[PDB]
Amino acid sequence: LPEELNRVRLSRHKLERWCHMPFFAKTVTGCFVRIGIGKPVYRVAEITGVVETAKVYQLGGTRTNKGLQLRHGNDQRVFRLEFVSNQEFTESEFMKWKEAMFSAGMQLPTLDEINKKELSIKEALNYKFNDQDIEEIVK
Amino acid sequence: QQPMIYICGECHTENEIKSRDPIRCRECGYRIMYKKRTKRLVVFDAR
């Protein structure tokens, strides 16, 4: 279903609050994003890890140069956090992603996996900043 | 769902400070910050 898959969709507004929070390669790795390719067609890709690009760009108020190593079945390349769209996974895009996953041979994540992963972002959002992370954030 | 937004001292940049947290700005890092105007009906009589 597309509705259950949009629960872990990391929109463009949520990523602005974890630009410098540690454990970025743990809570983010697992979710899906609607990266814009470019005309209005979109392709859902899996978050394999985290990379850092040499180009510095501003995204509204804040500004980040980090990348995002994504993959859509087999075709993989470097992307940016500025091309991500806030739209939800449509039926056509959902079917396209399902077909790409089936063709690439990657087993579809089980429903319980998404159910237990969606809580990661929720518990990270209300995380108290009691440790020594503000120093690294300001740096 | 009000996280008690604040305004930094010198940056004048909004910050979300909750209870049991240090009082510092999201960037640079200072120790002074003020509050924002209330949302109540501030109504005066031009007298």
Partner: peptide, 17 residues
Amino acid sequence: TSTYGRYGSQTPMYGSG
């Protein structure tokens, strides 16, 4: 205050660049 999108703020594309 999770995501005040209200659509969005004109999201750029990859090939457009």
